Amino acid sequence: HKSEVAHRFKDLGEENFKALVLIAFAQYLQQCPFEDHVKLVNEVTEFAKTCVADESAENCDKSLHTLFGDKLCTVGEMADCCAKQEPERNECFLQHKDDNPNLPRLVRPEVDVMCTAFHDNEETFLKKYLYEIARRHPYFYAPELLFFAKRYKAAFTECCQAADKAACLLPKLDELRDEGKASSAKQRLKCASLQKFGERAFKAWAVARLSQRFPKAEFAEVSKLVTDLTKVHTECCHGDLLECADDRADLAKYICENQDSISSKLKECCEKPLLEKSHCIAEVENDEMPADLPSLAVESKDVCKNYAEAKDVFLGMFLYEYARRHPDYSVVLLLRLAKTYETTLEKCCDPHECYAKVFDEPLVEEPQNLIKQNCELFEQLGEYKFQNALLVRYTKKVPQVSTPTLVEVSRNLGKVGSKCCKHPEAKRMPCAEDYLSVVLNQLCVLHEKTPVSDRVTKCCTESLVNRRPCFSALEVDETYVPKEFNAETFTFDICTLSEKERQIKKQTALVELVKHKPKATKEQLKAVMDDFAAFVEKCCKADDKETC
Ligand SMILES: O=C1CCc2ccc(OCCCCN3CCN(c4cccc(Cl)c4Cl)CC3)cc2N1
Ligand SMILES: COc1c(C)c2c(c(O)c1C/C=C(\C)CCC(=O)O)C(=O)OC2
Question: Is 189 in the pocket of ligand 2 (CB under 6 A)?
Answer without folding.
Answer: yes
